[PDB]
Scaffold this active site. Structure first.
Site, PDB file in Angstrom:
ATOM      1  N   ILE A  23     -16.635  -8.514 -55.666  1.00  0.00           N
ATOM      2  CA  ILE A  23     -15.414  -8.497 -54.843  1.00  0.00           C
ATOM      3  C   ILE A  23     -15.651  -7.956 -53.420  1.00  0.00           C
ATOM      4  CG2 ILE A  23     -13.903  -8.350 -56.847  1.00  0.00           C
ATOM      5  CD1 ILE A  23     -13.411  -5.308 -55.508  1.00  0.00           C
ATOM      6  N   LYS A  46     -17.113  -2.910 -63.565  1.00  0.00           N
ATOM      7  CA  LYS A  46     -17.780  -1.909 -62.752  1.00  0.00           C
ATOM      8  C   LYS A  46     -19.072  -1.573 -63.441  1.00  0.00           C
ATOM      9  CE  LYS A  46     -14.971   1.364 -61.046  1.00  0.00           C
ATOM     10  NZ  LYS A  46     -13.721   2.048 -60.601  1.00  0.00           N
ATOM     11  N   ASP A 152      -6.650  13.040 -55.543  1.00  0.00           N
ATOM     12  CA  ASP A 152      -7.074  12.229 -54.395  1.00  0.00           C
ATOM     13  C   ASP A 152      -6.157  11.012 -54.197  1.00  0.00           C
ATOM     14  OD1 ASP A 152      -8.599  11.583 -52.160  1.00  0.00           O
ATOM     15  OD2 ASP A 152     -10.448  11.202 -53.269  1.00  0.00           O
TER      16      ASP A 152
HETATM   17  C1  LIG Z   1     -11.116  -9.274 -55.105  1.00  0.00           C
HETATM   18  C2  LIG Z   1     -10.342  -8.405 -54.886  1.00  0.00           C
HETATM   19  C3  LIG Z   1      -9.295  -7.383 -54.736  1.00  0.00           C
HETATM   20  N1  LIG Z   1      -9.751  -5.980 -54.798  1.00  0.00           N
HETATM   21  C4  LIG Z   1      -9.976  -5.330 -53.607  1.00  0.00           C
HETATM   22  O1  LIG Z   1      -9.855  -5.910 -52.534  1.00  0.00           O
HETATM   23  C5  LIG Z   1     -10.345  -3.850 -53.621  1.00  0.00           C
HETATM   24  C6  LIG Z   1      -9.243  -3.008 -52.999  1.00  0.00           C
HETATM   25  N2  LIG Z   1     -10.703  -3.284 -54.946  1.00  0.00           N
HETATM   26  C7  LIG Z   1     -11.403  -1.997 -54.990  1.00  0.00           C
HETATM   27  C8  LIG Z   1     -10.331  -3.946 -56.104  1.00  0.00           C
HETATM   28  N3  LIG Z   1     -10.407  -3.275 -57.271  1.00  0.00           N
HETATM   29  C9  LIG Z   1     -10.015  -3.908 -58.392  1.00  0.00           C
HETATM   30  N4  LIG Z   1     -10.095  -3.239 -59.581  1.00  0.00           N
HETATM   31  C10 LIG Z   1     -10.250  -1.858 -59.873  1.00  0.00           C
HETATM   32  C11 LIG Z   1      -9.817  -1.437 -61.128  1.00  0.00           C
HETATM   33  C12 LIG Z   1      -9.957  -0.116 -61.481  1.00  0.00           C
HETATM   34  F1  LIG Z   1      -9.531   0.264 -62.705  1.00  0.00           F
HETATM   35  C13 LIG Z   1     -10.513   0.828 -60.622  1.00  0.00           C
HETATM   36  O2  LIG Z   1     -10.655   2.149 -60.939  1.00  0.00           O
HETATM   37  C14 LIG Z   1     -10.937   0.384 -59.380  1.00  0.00           C
HETATM   38  F2  LIG Z   1     -11.485   1.281 -58.529  1.00  0.00           F
HETATM   39  C15 LIG Z   1     -10.826  -0.934 -58.996  1.00  0.00           C
HETATM   40  N5  LIG Z   1      -9.554  -5.175 -58.434  1.00  0.00           N
HETATM   41  C16 LIG Z   1      -9.481  -5.857 -57.292  1.00  0.00           C
HETATM   42  C17 LIG Z   1      -9.858  -5.296 -56.052  1.00  0.00           C
END
Ligand SMILES: C#CCN1C(=O)[C@@H](C)N(C)c2nc(Nc3cc(F)c(O)c(F)c3)ncc21
Ligand SMILES: [Cl-]
Length: 316
Positions: A23, A46, A152
């Site tokens: 991503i 992850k 946080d």
């Molecule tokens: C493609 C796309 C969209 N997308 C983004 O743009 C950025 C902002 N991030 C970090 C995303 N994180 C996730 N899942 C996530 C789930 C968890 F449970 C976590 O703890 C975690 F940190 C992240 N899903 C999609 C995104």
């Protein structure tokens, strides 16, 4: 490269997943099928070295407090529209190239609030800020009741639901803290196993004093987020390089909340629910349990004042 793109991985409960592109070490993921993992994938995976401490901490939280039926049961009994804790779908160990990796499957989301906040020239309306903060109070109540604090809270840890832009989720539990294992609150002191202070502009006074975070800290952090979101600023933002300065202003403004309202808002024009929110969080002892419903009723009075109601619309 921890994965071969499109390969099938099997978590420790024997559920199969296909791994996809990264991503924007987090990859798109979906259930195992003959179809490949696309742009609209509903999960992420992850992955980190198995000796990575944060992912183990985050994993344990999700295992303990984020089981899909656990969340869905809470939603029904507390009569909620949704609950902004991401769902845990599985995890496992994955060896590649003679190195051991831990992986975890989680919900996929849309954009973080920090990007959207910056796209509005660093202002969210009073409607948005009250609607966001009500749902965060639901999130905080939940994780607090399952023995954890986040420590946080900030816009970049707030992600919108991918298929519903009026649902916000609190993510990133890698430096979360188990304040209440087996119902025994930690005492007012430092914890050597931890050494994260938070994010400096938003962290609690407790954290600045080097004690472990607790429930009141999270509500304090949310308080500072609310003012940041409403005004575009925090009094102490031009001195973030000195933690002594930031603790000093926070302690001083805690003691005189009217002078914080006068400092952050135009003269004689400050939202009364924010001041009332800060005043209530101020009263909390370190070990004390917040009256979450009264905090939400305070933010509800604010929606009434602007000719609105809790209709779930974030207006982003
Ligand atoms: C493609 C796309 C969209 N997308 C983004 O743009 C950025 C902002 N991030 C970090 C995303 N994180 C996730 N899942 C996530 C789930 C968890 F449970 C976590 O703890 C975690 F940190 C992240 N899903 C999609 C995104
Ligand atoms: Cl291999």
């Amino acid at each position: 490269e921890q994965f071969a793109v499109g390969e099938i991985i099997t978590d420790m409960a024997a559920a199969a997943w296909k791994v996809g592109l990264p991503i924007g070490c987090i990859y798109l993921a979906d259930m195992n099928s003959s179809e490949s993992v696309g742009s609209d994938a509903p999960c992420v995976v992850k992955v980190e070295p198995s000796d990575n401490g944060p992912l183990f901490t985050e994993l344990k939280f999700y295992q303990r407090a984020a089981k899909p039926e656990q969340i869905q049961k809470w939603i029904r009994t507390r009569k909620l529209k949704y609950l902004g804790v991401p769902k845990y779908w599985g995890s496992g160990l994955h060896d590649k190239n003679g190195k051991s990796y831990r992986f975890m499957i989680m919900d996929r989301f849309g954009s973080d609030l920090q990007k959207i906040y910056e796209a509005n020239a660093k202002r969210f309306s009073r409607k948005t800020v009250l609607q966001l903060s009500l749902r965060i109070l639901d999130i905080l109540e939940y994780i607090h009741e399952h023995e954890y604090v986040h420590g946080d809270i900030k816009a970049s840890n707030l992600l919108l639901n991918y298929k519903n832009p009026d649902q916000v989720y609190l993510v990133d539990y890698g430096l979360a803290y188990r304040y209440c294992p087996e119902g025994v609150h930690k005492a007012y002191a430092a914890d050597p196993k931890r050494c994260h202070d938070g994010t400096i502009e938003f962290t609690s006074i407790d954290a600045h004093n080097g004690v472990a975070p607790s429930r009141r800290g999270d509500l304090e952090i949310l308080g500072y987020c609310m003012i940041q979101w409403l005004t575009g600023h925090l009094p102490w933002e031009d001195n973030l390089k000195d933690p002594k300065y930031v603790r000093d202003s926070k302690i001083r403004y805690r003691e005189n909340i009217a002078s914080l309202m006068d400092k952050c808002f135009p003269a004689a024009n400050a939202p009364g629910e924010i001041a009332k929110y800060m005043e209530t969080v101020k009263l909390l002892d370190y070990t004390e349990k917040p009256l979450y419903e009264n905090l939400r009723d305070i933010l509800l009075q604010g929606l009434k004042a602007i000719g609105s109601k809790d209709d779930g619309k974030l207006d982003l």
